Amino acid sequence: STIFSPEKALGLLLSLKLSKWQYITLRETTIREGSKEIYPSYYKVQKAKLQCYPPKAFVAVTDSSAKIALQALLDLTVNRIFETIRSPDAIQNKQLILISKWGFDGASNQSRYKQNIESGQGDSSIFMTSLVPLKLTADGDTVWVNPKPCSPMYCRPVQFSFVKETKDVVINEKTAMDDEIEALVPSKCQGHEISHKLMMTMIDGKICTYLSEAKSNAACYLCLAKPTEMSKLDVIASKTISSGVYEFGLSTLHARINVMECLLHIAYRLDFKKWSARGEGHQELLHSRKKLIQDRFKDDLNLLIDIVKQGSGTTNDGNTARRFFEFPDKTAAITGLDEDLIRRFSVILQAITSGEIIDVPKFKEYARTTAEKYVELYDWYYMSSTVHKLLIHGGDIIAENAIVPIGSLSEEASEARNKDFRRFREHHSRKKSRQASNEDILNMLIISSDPLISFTRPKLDAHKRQTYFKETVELLQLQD
Amino acid sequence: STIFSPEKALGLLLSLKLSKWQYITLRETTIREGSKEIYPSYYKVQKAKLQCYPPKAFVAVTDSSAKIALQALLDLTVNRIFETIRSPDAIQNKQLILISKWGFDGASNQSRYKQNIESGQGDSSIFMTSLVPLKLTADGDTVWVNPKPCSPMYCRPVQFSFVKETKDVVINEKTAMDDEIEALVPSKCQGHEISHKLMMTMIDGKICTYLSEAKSNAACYLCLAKPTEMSKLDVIASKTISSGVYEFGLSTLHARINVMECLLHIAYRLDFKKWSARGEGHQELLHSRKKLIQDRFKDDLNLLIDIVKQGSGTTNDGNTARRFFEFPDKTAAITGLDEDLIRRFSVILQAITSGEIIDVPKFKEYARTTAEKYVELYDWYYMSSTVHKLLIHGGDIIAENAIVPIGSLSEEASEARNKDFRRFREHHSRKKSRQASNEDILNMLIISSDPLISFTRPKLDAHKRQTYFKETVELLQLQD
DNA sequence: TCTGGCCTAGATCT
DNA sequence: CACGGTGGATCGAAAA
DNA sequence: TTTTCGATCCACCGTGAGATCTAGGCCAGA
DNA sequence: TCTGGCCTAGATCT
DNA sequence: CACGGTGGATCGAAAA
C-alpha cells in the first residue's frame, strides 16, 4: 500500500537507469525527508523482477556464455503481451499469429576483466543473438503491433557469447537456431494457441555472405555475380534466386553507409573514372582529391570523416548518412554529382525506412529507372553489392517480405542494443564473477524489453514526422 | 516550501547522476502519483547551480578550450568552505592558511564529434588542469581537512584543452600557471583573510621529465643520473638536488606500476640476468619465460596482462597493483623472487599511501636497507627511475613535503576525474555546440566538487580499514 | 694494449 | 593499501 | 509460520594510453 | 593472333 | 525518416 506500484517502481527504476544502492539511497533519503511512504523497497522490485524472469528450466548462465531456449522466450514474452491487450478475452476467441524478426551481431572493443582466465579467447569481443515480436494478426487482423518497431526497447536476447565473429561459429549457430525454430510449437495462454513465424532478417549482409554460397563479399549474394557482370540489367534479371535467400531481407542499415562510401569513391575518381583505383597516378589523384573533398565538405557541412588505424574506412553510421541526405544539393555541388540520382536514392531510402506498405510495381519502376540513370551517368564504377541488391533485387524481396512493412524489419534496432549491453555490463552488473555479470546482463536485458513495462514506462516522442519527398509519397502506399 | 531543499535537490541530482529531462520526468510522474509536493522544479535547482558557479568575469568558455583564473576559484571554493565549518565565526578570529595541491593530466581515446571543424587537432585527446584544497590551519590548527583527501569528489578544474600532451604546451602552461600562482592574493571573506599555498604535486613523473632538465625519462630527475650509475648509493648521496624539484613530490601512482613492471622484467630475466634484454638468445628466452610466467600467474591468481597495439606494456593500474600485493608470497613463489624485498616494497607503499605522518629517520633507514638488500640480491638489473627516487630520494622529499601527510598529496584522485570527464561529456552535456559542451563540462565539474554539496551528498563508506603490516606500523607514525 | 667516434639498433615507460 | 561503487545470498530479526 | 526489510559481504572495475637516451657493436688502430 | 598461369599487388568492407 | 536524449532562451501565464 505504498504510493508507487511495484510494476511502476520497476519501470521507473529501469527508465531512470538507477542502481540498487542508488534506489535504497533515494528511498531512505526521501523517508528522511518525512513523507512516511514513497516507494516499495528493493525487495518489492526484485519480486517484480521475478515476474519478468523466464523459468530456470530454460535459462543457462555460465562463466563464459549464456543462452535461453527459444520457445521459452516466446511463451514468456507473449504472456507479457496478453496483458498489453486492452482485454485479452474481448478479442475474437481464435488462434493468433505472431510474426517476429530475429538475428544477431558481433560487436568488439569490449572492456576486459581481470578474473576467470577461462580458456576461450577471454572477453575480447561480444557476439549476441536476439529476437523481437513485431506483429500479431489473425488473418491480417492486427490485435497488437509494436508502436515503435524500431526502438531498441523491444529487442529480446536469445543468447550471448564472448567470441569474435567468424564464419564457422556463424554458420553453426545459424543452422542450430534454424533447427530450433523448426522444432518450436505455438505458444499457449489460458485457452489461446498462437503460432509464431520468425524471420532471420536482423542481420547484416556482411554475415549474410557467410550465410550465402559466395566466397566473395563483393559478389551479390542474391545474384552470385561479379562486379563487372553486375553492371548489366538483363543477365541478372535472367538469373535465378538462391534457396530462401529472400529471408535475408533488405538490410536498410548498410545500404545507406555503402551509398555514402560508393558516392565518395566516385567523387574521388571523377578524375580518371575507373572502378579500381589501381593504375598510374590514380593513387596520387585519389589521395589529393579525397583530401580536397574532405576539406571542402568539412568547411561547408561541418563534419569530419572518422579515422581508424586497426583498419576501416569510416564510421558514417546514422548521422553522417542522414546529414548527407538532409540537403543533397550540398554534396551535389561539393562533389559535383547529379542531384537527381541522389534524390532517387533518398526516395528509395525513405520508402524503405517509412515502415509502411509499398507498391512494388512503382518501386520496381523507379529502381530500374535508377539503374538506367546510374549506368548512363556513372558506368565506369561497378556499383556495390548492396546498391545492386537494391536496384535489381530489392523489389523482389520487398514482394517476398511484404507480410510485414519494411523498416520495421531492420537491424538498426537490434545493434543499437549493444549500446545498452556495454552500459548494462559496466553499471548494472555485479562484478564478483563473470558468471554473475552474465546473469546480470541476462536479466537486465529481459527487463529492458519486458513488453508490459516497455509499454508503461517513460519515453520521449516529439520527433513525430518530417518532410517526405514528392516522388516518394507518389511511390508511398500510405494509408491510415 | 517543498519537501526537498534546493541544495539537497542538487546534491541528490548529481549523486544519482540524473539528467534534466530525467528529473522533470521523475518529478511529473511523482506528482502524477498524487503526492502534491515532492521536489523543487529544475528551475529551482538551476538557481541553486547559480550559487555554485564562479562569476562570469573569470570564466572563459570557447569552442575549443576553456579556463578560469586561479584566484577566482580559490575565493569561490573557500567561500563554499566557510559554510562547511560548524560556525565560521566561532573559530579564532585570525588569518587561516589553505594548503592545496594542484596539477594536470593528458588523457586520450576521446570521443570525436561531428561539428565545428576548428583548426586545432580536432578533439583527439583531452588535457586538463585541476586543483584541490587539502588543509586549512592557523599555525597547524586544523580548522578544516578533507575527510577523504583521495576521493575524486574534491578535484576542481582550472582549465581544459583539446590538445595532446607535448613538452612544449606542458612547459608553457606550467610556467604560466606558476606565474599566476605568484600573482595571487589571500582570499577575503566577511573579515577573514586567508593565505593559500599551492603544491604542484598532482603530476606524474612522466611530465616531470619535461619539467626537469633531463633529456631522458629513464634518468632520475632528482639525481640527473644514468641507470648504470644509478646503482650506487654513495655517488648519488653525494649529488646535489635541483632547484625546488621537491615540489615534484612523490607520485605514489607510477611507483607501484613501475614496481610491478620492473619485478616482472626481472622475473623474465632470471635466466640471463642482465638489465637490457639485448644479446644472444635473451630475446627468445624473454619471450618464452614471459609467456610461461603470464600463464602460471594467470592460472593461479586469475589475471590477464592487458594488450596494447598502438604500443604500451600493460595497464596494471590499481587493481593489478593491489592484487599483486595482497599476498606477495604468491608472486614470490610463481616468479621466484624474494618475499622479504616485496614485503619491504609493501611496507613503503603502505607508509606512503597511509595518509599520515611518517618518521623520516626510520623511513630513510628502511629505504637504504631496501637498497642494500636489492643490490645484493638483484644488482644486474638497473632499478627504474621511480624505485631509485623512492629508495634514495624519497625520505628527502618526504621531509620537504611533510607539511601535508603524503598520500593525500596524490594524482590518483585527480586522474580518476577523467572517468567523470568522459561520462560528463557524454551524458550531461548539451551537444548543440562544442562551446556548449565546454560550458556543460565546466559547470558540471564545478558542481561535482562543490565543497558544501560534496559534504552533504550520498556516499558509501564501509571500506574503513584493512590490515597494515607489522614493520609498517613500526615505521608508521600513527596518532589520533 | 683500451679510449673515443659513430651509430645504432634495439631495449624503455606510458 | 583509492575509492566510489556493483545485485544476490544470506542472517537475522522484527513485523505480520 | 511467512513476509519484509535492513545490513553484509562478496571478488573485483574504472579511471592512469608517443618519442627516447643509452648499452652495446664494431671498426679501426701503430 | 589472344587464352592461361602466376601472382600479385594493391583495391575492398568493417 | 531510431530514438533516447542534451541545458538555455523564451513564451506565456499563472502565482505571488
Add this chain to the structure above:
DNA sequence: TTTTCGATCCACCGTGAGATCTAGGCCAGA
C-alpha cells in the same frame, strides 16, 4: 511588476571496428 514553471526547440551523439577474391599485368606463344 516579478517569479516561476512547463513546454519547446535547438543541431546534433552513441551505439555499428580483420582477411578477401578478383581485376588486371604479363609472359609466352607457332
